[PDB]
Every structure is written in C-alpha cells, then in structure tokens.
C-alpha cells in the first residue's frame, strides 16, 4: 500500500485533463502480485459513469453529502503507461452532458 498519484490528460492532447481534479489522494496496493488503485472521485454524483480499459470502476463506497463522494477502484497492468478511460459527465441542472475519452497514467507520489 503506497501514497500514489493520477496524472489525466485531454484524450490524445498531453495538456492535463480537468478530470484530474475530480480525483484526490490517490493509493496504490498491491494484491496477488497484482497492482491496484484505490483512488477518491470527488462530486462523484456528475458520473452517470466511469470506464476503465470498458468496463466501470468498482465503487467500494458512496457518499452522498457534497454532490457524492465514492471511493472507486481498479486495477492497471503496468505503473508508468498510459490508460484509456471514459466517463459520462452528467450535470441536471445546467445541464451537462457530456461523455469524454481521456488517457491516464498513475504512478507513485513521491519516489519510491
Ligand atoms: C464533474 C464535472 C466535470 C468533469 C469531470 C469534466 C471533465 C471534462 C473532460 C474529461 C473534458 C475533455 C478532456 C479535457 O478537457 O481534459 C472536458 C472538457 C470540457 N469541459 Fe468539462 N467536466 C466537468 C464539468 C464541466 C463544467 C461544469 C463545465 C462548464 C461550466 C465544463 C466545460 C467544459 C467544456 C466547454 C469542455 C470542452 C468541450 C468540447 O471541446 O467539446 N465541464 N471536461
């Protein structure tokens, strides 16, 4: 279990995707010698959905305080390359809707 970080980038674009700042402290575990992250998706209530290389991310909690809050979780093959992944962004009242295909790497924080 380690201190991670996820770095999003707007589809085929390298600029840093918004999406980063839906997603906080990040960690990464280790199971079955098999790599996990465990990451915070804040206003988790805008994600009608979120897809991973597609299948959705595994919600292992759920808040419902602050426009949702869920503590979801997938697995990557290797640390340092680049995922596709997908999400709905779905806003009622605005009203915003929009899927989006972006690319993410995650890595650790700090040096190992
Ligand atoms: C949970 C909320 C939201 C998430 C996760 C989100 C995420 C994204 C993503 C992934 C993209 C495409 C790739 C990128 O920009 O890096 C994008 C683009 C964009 N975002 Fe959002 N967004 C959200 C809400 C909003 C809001 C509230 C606004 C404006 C008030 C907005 C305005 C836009 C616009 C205009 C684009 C580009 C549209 C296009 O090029 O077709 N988004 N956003």
Redesign the pocket.
Known sequence: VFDAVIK????N?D?????TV?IKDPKLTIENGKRIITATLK?SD??DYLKVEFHDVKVLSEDKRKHGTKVIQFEVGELGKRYNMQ?H?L?PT?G?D?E?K?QFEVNMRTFV
């Open positions: 999003a980038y707007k589809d674009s600029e840093e995707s918004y999406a839906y206003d805008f994600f999400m962004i806003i605005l915003y929009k989006f972006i």
